Amino acid sequence: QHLTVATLEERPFVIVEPADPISGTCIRDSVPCRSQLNEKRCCKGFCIDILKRLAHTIGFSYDLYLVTNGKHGKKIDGVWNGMIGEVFYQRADMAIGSLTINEERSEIVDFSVPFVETGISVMVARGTTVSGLSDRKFQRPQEQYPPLKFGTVPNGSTEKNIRSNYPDMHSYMVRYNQPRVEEALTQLKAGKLDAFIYDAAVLNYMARKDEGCKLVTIGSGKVFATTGYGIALHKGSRWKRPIDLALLQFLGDDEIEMLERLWLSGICH
Ligand SMILES: CCCc1cnn(O)c1[C@@H](N)C(=O)O
């Protein structure tokens, strides 16, 4: 069969590039992907490598598109956007990327088994002195004269988690919302942020490849639950079982571990 697949750029899980200007095609290991709004684009990365393996193992063809209506998935006044919205409203058969499994989402779409471990971590400059996410600097923040400056990228599972588990801290953080990881790290490297709270799998990767190894993460410890990325599918989808079996097979064949090495490794430790 042929599946429609929604995705979203977040390096290095999904990396988007123009087609090779010489051949006009997607060269190397990249695959064609178009925009939801619709210039030819190509996608590659850890999740794209997973997607290629699923299509070959299970035997489906697919067209892949980039979501423009929001990002991962947020429910605003009864309506979902992002990758979750695409699957929920049956515009796509599945969505794959750095898509975190949570309770709110699982209520409305099915997820595959998780294939990347994630959660919530905090990034700080290697210099900054702060304990972790238990710290009062984070929790009770207007309690300091020049308060700690820390933010996240809003509208994802991280912000949902914080606003739900730590409502007081959330109303403070909102001032320090960032549009993308790229901007957050820039602000963090410049003192405009003291800390950046974000998806663990992505943040841990950013630290591992930070130029000069000047940025480090601290783990949430007990402050936040461990979770995973999963492929989103229609509630009741016939595709969940075969996708699961394939993923479980990759996970024990050492194919996922290989992909981890390929995509997610860095020089800093
Ligand atoms: C644009 C938000 C990105 C983000 C922040 N936290 N988490 O978990 C995500 C994303 N992985 C998600 O699934 O919402």
Side-chain angles (χ1 to χ4, degrees):
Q1 274 289 132
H2 181 84
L3 302 181
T4 298
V5 180
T7 194
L8 179 71
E9 187 171 26
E10 173 140 59
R11 308 192 178 203
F13 295 96
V14 183
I15 300 153
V16 179
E17 288 171 349
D20 165 52
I22 294 319
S23 70
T25 68
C26 294
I27 59 178
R28 209 67 94 60
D29 56 310
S30 67
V31 312
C33 53
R34 60 180 190 286
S35 166
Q36 182 179 3
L37 284 161
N38 303 317
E39 295 85 357
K40 184 190 181 164
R41 286 178 245 258
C42 306
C43 294
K44 69 184 172 176
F46 182 96
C47 292
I48 304 306
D49 273 2
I50 299 292
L51 171 56
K52 288 188 279 174
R53 280 156 179 75
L54 294 170
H56 183 269
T57 287
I58 295 170
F60 58 86
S61 54
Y62 62 88
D63 25 64
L64 180 61
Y65 68 101
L66 292 161
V67 177
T68 56
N69 181 47
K71 302 288 174 191
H72 289 82
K74 184 179 172 57
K75 186 179 184 171
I76 306 136
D77 202 30
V79 181
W80 285 90
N81 71 6
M83 283 183 282
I84 295 294
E86 293 304 288
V87 172
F88 181 54
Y89 300 118
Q90 298 189 277
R91 309 199 271 260
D93 297 293
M94 80 193 234
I96 181 166
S98 46
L99 183 56
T100 303
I101 300 168
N102 67 22
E103 281 188 25
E104 191 188 32
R105 295 168 175 178
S106 300
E107 93 207 326
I108 50 131
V109 298
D110 288 5
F111 278 102
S112 70
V113 297
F115 59 92
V116 173
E117 193 178 289
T118 193
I120 293 174
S121 297
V122 193
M123 178 174 269
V124 299
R126 193 161 259 267
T128 292
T129 349
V130 117
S131 63
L133 269 191
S134 75
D135 187 304
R136 312 184 52 137
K137 259 176 279 191
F138 289 115
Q139 303 274 16
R140 326 228 174 281
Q142 300 138 231
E143 197 242 297
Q144 272 97 169
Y145 171 20
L148 189 73
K149 300 191 292 260
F150 59 104
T152 182
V153 173
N155 304 329
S157 62
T158 291
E159 185 195 19
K160 183 74 174 61
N161 199 315
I162 302 180
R163 172 188 267 258
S164 295
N165 296 289
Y166 306 103
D168 197 30
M169 177 183 163
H170 175 264
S171 186
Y172 178 82
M173 290 182 65
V174 155
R175 299 208 284 167
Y176 303 106
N177 278 350
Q178 302 294 318
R180 296 191 294 177
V181 167
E182 297 58 49
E183 274 78 17
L185 304 190
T186 289
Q187 289 238 308
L188 187 68
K189 278 183 181 289
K192 308 198 170 173
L193 286 186
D194 301 321
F196 177 43
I197 301 167
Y198 198 69
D199 173 75
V202 170
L203 257 201
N204 290 324
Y205 171 81
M206 292 314 277
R208 287 196 299 276
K209 66 117 190 107
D210 180 50
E211 177 165 287
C213 301
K214 305 306 183 193
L215 292 179
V216 299
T217 63
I218 300 139
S220 68
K222 165 58 199 175
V223 181
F224 285 127
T226 303
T227 181
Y229 293 164
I231 295 180
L233 300 137
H234 292 176
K235 172 68 55 194
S237 179
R238 68 149 293 250
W239 293 101
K240 172 173 169 44
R241 176 64 163 165
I243 288 177
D244 285 345
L245 287 175
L247 287 173
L248 292 173
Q249 197 180 286
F250 303 160
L251 268 150
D253 214 293
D254 287 326
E255 190 85 354
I256 307 291
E257 175 162 335
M258 180 272 296
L259 291 176
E260 296 171 10
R261 288 192 281 136
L262 181 59
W263 291 104
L264 308 181
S265 53
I267 47 95
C268 311
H269 57 44

